[PDB]
From a paper:
Recently, two L. pneumophila effectors MavC and MvcA, were identified as structural homologs of cycle inhibiting factor (Cif) effectors. MavC catalyzes the transglutamination reaction between Ub and UBE2N, leading to UBE2N ubiquitination in an unconventional form. Non-canonical ubiquitination of UBE2N by MavC abolishes its activity in the formation of K63-type polyubiquitin chains, which dampens NF-κB signaling in the initial phase of L. pneumophila infection.
To gain insights into the catalytic process of this non-canonical ubiquitination, we purified the MavC-catalyzed non-canonical ubiquitination product UBE2N–Ub conjugate to homogeneity, and cocrystallized it with MavCC74A. Then we solved the crystal structure of the MavCC74A/UBE2N–Ub complex at a resolution of 2.39 Å. Structural alignment with the MavC/UBE2N/Ub complex reveals a marked movement of K92/K94 loop region in the MavCC74A/UBE2N–Ub structure, which forms a short helix in known structures of free UBE2N, to our knowledge. Whereas MavC expressed in the ∆mavC mutant induced UBE2N ubiquitination in infected cells, expression of MavCM317A in strain ∆mavC did not cause UBE2N modification in cells despite the mutant protein was properly expressed and translocated into host cells. Thus, UBE2N binding by MavC probably promotes the disorganization of the K92/K94 loop of UBE2N; the formation of the isopeptide bond with Ub completes the conformational changes of this loop. Superimposition between the structures of UBE2N–Ub conjugate in our study and the canonically activated form of UBE2N bound to Ub indicated that this unique ubiquitination at K92 of UBE2N causes a steric clash to restrain Ub loading through its G76 to the active site C87 of UBE2N, thus explaining the inhibition of E2 activity of UBE2N by this modification. During the co-crystallization of MavC and UBE2N–Ub conjugate, interestingly, we found that wildtype MavC, but not the C74A mutant, can actually cleave the UBE2N–Ub conjugate back to UBE2N and Ub.
Numbering used by the authors:
A (entry chain G): 1 to 151
B (entry chain C): -1 to 73
C (entry chain B): 3 to 381
Write the structure that this text describes.
């Protein structure tokens, strides 16, 4: 709470008070601009029953600039690269302070239910998603059970 | 101090712009809009293999007299 | 004039059928030229170990040069070129845009019962969201972050998208008061309209609020409009005023081509709104201030087919004002049909095939061959 504009303090408290369903997001003790995030694999998606760990970080320029987010758990998704980064891409526009931490988290969650392999970040993964969606989904189920079912 | 650069597309069509070395990349995109009727939000510019970012400036990429930019129309 | 409408709809049906089946080939560009230029732009992405020539193939496999443009502006240029001919398009380009009036009426009154082409350009109001205190000694317009408010000890200025400094008309007394009230380190360089800032809380927070009110009032007379989207509407002549349809044609950056728009029949689906229903949605897009209705209408009018309800949610909610602008011109069906028929013969001649998919693939392999050879000869 120390050293922060009222907006970050209140975004934080309202995330803790009324968390996004399926998402746990709590700030680190030593650093309040850093959030330890856990997103559950949506139901009826290849990631169901998984529990994916992510890092969400508010740089010094937040909220003028978007949060940085990274997956920590490996995941087989056409929009997550080998290093855990996601496409928070706003078409025909840029990040704006009208967007919030909650919006970023809801978008990642939605993206797990709606993979988009036509505008990709993980190419190998996206190729197989467009070409062989059934095999891509099976592999993701296997990745989920190997990497995301005990932390 | 005005100067002149070229913008080329995949079809080989080339246009000529008059610009200043301090001109922002969004000013360049608006000059492309003036010539071609293409919105800035529907343009990507490439110089020397790298993308020209909004909010930066022509000199920040060291773009000078008679440089050829590449206008990408599929992303 | 019973059966009179179908010579415009044949123009519509021909361009739709050809774009659907031929994609980028309707521009009439020979496959060789496409491959040659893609080659020159591609040289630097090559891996130069092993036999570079086998990874040249890796580059040619990597090519997307036959996939159609998804620039909304470029697709509009192509629709204009096909339907009006190169010279007609050039005359249409010279006429001025009209700002769509609040109720759309100026556009409805610009659609007499002839075959018409509408071009639309839509702007988004790109006003500053950020400010920073700065000393005059430290402020350099060329290098400073653009589209930003700068509060100096004796001046309040707006550094616009073109790096020009616009004074905001405040006395040095007012600026000195505002500068000296905003003292907290993390409010020296911040955002303008924070919903959590309370003018009744603090002298600093009242100064931040007052500066936002000043900037907001001044931006109302400053041109912050930047073109964001472009499309066309074909409006064939009809047999009765109440049975007239329009057909919107668009591509959309990083989202879809005009081929894909046509394949999902969004032109037909939107056509079912009628002229008044479509105009009314288009007119509301610009008058509403409810970001949820703006996003919902934007989604309905401009998403790729089937994404109307997800297109402008979440990260892509439409927070900024939009303004629709239009221009209208008459289309000669003989000219547009002759244009389309010349392109069809060009394609049939130079890229023969039993079906359209084979002509497309022959075109693609010809372009790949020309790219392969050019990249070979320069490495």
């Amino acid at each position: 709470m120390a050293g922060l504009p009222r907006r970050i303090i209140k975004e934080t408290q309202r995330l803790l008070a009324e968390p996004v369903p399926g998402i746990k997001a709590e700030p680190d003790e030593s650093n309040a601009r850093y959030f330890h995030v856990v997103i559950a694999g949506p139901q009826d998606s290849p990631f169901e029953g998984g529990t994916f760990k992510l890092e969400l970080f508010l740089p010094e320029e937040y909220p003028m600039a978007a949060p940085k987010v990274r997956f920590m758990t490996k995941i087989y998704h056409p929009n997550v690269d080998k290093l855990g980064r996601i496409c928070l891409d706003i078409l025909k526009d840029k990040w704006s302070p009208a967007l919030q931490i909650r919006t970023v988290l809801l978008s990642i969650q939605a993206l797990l239910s709606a993979p988009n392999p036509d505008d990709p970040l993980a190419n190998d993964v996206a190729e197989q998603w467009k070409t062989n969606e059934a095999q891509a989904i099976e592999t993701a189920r296997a990745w989920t059970r190997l990497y995301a079912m005990n932390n | 101090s005005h100067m002149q650069i070229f913008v080329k597309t995949l079809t080989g069509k080339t246009i000529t712009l008059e610009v200043e070395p301090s001109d922002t990349i969004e000013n360049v995109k608006a000059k492309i809009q003036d010539k071609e009727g293409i919105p800035p939000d529907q343009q990507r510019l490439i110089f020397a293999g790298k993308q020209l970012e909004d909010g930066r400036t022509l000199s920040d990429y060291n773009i000078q007299k008679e440089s050829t930019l590449h206008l990408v129309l599929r992303l | 004039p019973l059966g009179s409408e179908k010579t415009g709809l044949h123009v519509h049906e021909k361009i739709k059928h050809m774009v659907k089946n031929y994609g980028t080939m309707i521009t009439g560009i020979p496959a060789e030229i496409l491959g040659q230029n893609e080659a020159e732009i591609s040289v630097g992405y090559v891996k130069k170990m092993g036999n570079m020539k086998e990874n040249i193939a890796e580059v040619v496999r990597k090519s997307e040069m036959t996939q159609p443009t998804n620039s909304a502006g470029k697709a509009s240029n192509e629709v204009c070129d096909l339907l009006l001919g190169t010279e007609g398009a050039s005359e249409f380009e010279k006429s001025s845009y009209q700002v769509l009036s609040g109720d759309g009426s100026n556009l409805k009154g610009s659609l007499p019962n002839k075959n018409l082409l509408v071009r639309v350009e839509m702007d988004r109001f790109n006003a500053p969201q950020k400010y920073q205190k700065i000393k005059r000694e430290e402020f350099n317009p060329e290098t400073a972050e653009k589209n930003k408010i700068y509060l100096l000890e004796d001046q309040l200025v707006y550094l616009d998208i073109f790096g020009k400094v616009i004074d905001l008309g405040q006395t040095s007394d007012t600026c000195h008061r505002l500068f000296n009230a905003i003292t907290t380190p993390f409010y020296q360089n911040y955002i303008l309209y924070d919903e959590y800032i309370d003018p009744e809380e603090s002298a600093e927070e009242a100064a931040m609020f007052e500066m936002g009110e000043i900037v907001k009032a001044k931006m109302k007379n400053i041109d912050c409009w930047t073109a964001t989207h472009s499309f066309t509407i074909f409006v064939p002549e009809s047999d009765s005023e109440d049975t007239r349809t329009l057909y919107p044609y668009q591509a959309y950056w990083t989202s879809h081509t005009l081929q894909q728009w046509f394949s999902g029949d969004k032109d037909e689906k939107l056509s079912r709104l009628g002229i008044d229903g479509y105009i009314e949605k288009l007119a509301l897009l610009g008058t509403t201030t409810d970001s949820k209705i703006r996003s919902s209408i934007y989604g309905e009018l401009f998403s790729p087919p089937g994404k109307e309800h997800v297109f402008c949610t979440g990260m892509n909610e439409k927070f900024s004002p939009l303004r629709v602008k239009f221009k209208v011109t008459e289309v000669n069906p003989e000219i547009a049909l002759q244009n389309l028929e010349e392109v069809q013969e060009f394609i049939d001649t130079n890229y023969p095939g039993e079906n359209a998919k084979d002509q497309c693939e022959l075109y693609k392999i010809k372009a790949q061959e020309a790219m392969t050879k050019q990249l070979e000869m320069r490495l």
